[PDB]
């Protein structure tokens, strides 16, 4: 098993994962870090990403029906 | 004693191309010590330089000879006595574009050096030993006096 | 120069874009070079380094740890000028010619 995609994370998969995780924050979930006094769980759910404290893995589909598991923290979050 | 540069400067042009600014002006300096081109600009309203006439320019660093380098400057504190009080015209700015004389495509020796007064443009030329320290980054003191004989 | 930037290209990391790149900065990389021997031709200047004259060598000064920091940075540039996967290149391209 070798890794024939690029290692850069995307902004589109990005996006989406934060989508996810601020929706899944505002379920009553467990929090994966200590926050500071601060509403609107978007806001603390980039925290998360820029501490790489995500359980969140990303599957990716090729044309033929591949399927490839990332892990966010593996991932390079560059900006 | 951190002397850089000295010299004694005739001014043999002044604002060739007509005029274009109200309170800057280029200007044209020689020298009989050392073949050299200085041109630099300097304000009018305060300095009114005129036509040919010969003034003594000094650029160093370190105003102070009691202290090795200081951090920041004061305006009005005179802690120690410095250079800026025996001369008549102060500046402070920083050399950029270490280039030499390219019409001599083979061997020569004339090293240019430019600086930025924070707007104002001074290009030097001469030769290389004459040259000693002008490091491409350096913050240097431009020190300016009228000689009148 | 030559041997230290085809000495430090030869890397475990830098095998993985297209030696086309490659080649093109080789070709930025060796134009430099002869503008440096013309330049220490010029006045006359050795390389072993010993030589009173102190600002002839202030000219153009290419040291070893800022071009690995160059190198480094383009390769880098060149990651993330490569397009997303996953991007609408159809209609990206539909309204390039609209305005």
Known sequence: ?79 | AGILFEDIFDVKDIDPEGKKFDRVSRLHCESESFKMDLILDVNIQIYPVDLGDKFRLVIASTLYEDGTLDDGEYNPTDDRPSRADQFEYVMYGKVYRIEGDETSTEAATRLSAYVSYGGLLMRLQGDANNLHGFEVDSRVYLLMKKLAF | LILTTESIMKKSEFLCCQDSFLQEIKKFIKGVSEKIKKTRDKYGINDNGTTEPRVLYQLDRITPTQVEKFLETCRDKYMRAQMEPGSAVGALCAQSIGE
Do not use: F
Not at chain 1, 7 to 12: A, D, N, V
Not at chain 1, 16 to 24: C, E, I, K, M, N
Not at chain 1, 29 to 51: H, S
């Open chain 1, 1 to 79: 098993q070798k890794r024939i995609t690029t290692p850069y994370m995307t902004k589109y998969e990005r996006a989406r994962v934060l989508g996810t995780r601020a929706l899944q924050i505002a379920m009553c979930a467990p929090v994966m870090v200590e926050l500071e006094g601060e509403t609107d769980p978007l806001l603390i759910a980039m925290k998360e990403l820029k501490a790489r404290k995500i359980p969140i893995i990303i599957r990716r589909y090729l044309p033929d029906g591949s399927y490839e598991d990332w892990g966010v923290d593996e991932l390079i979050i560059t900006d």
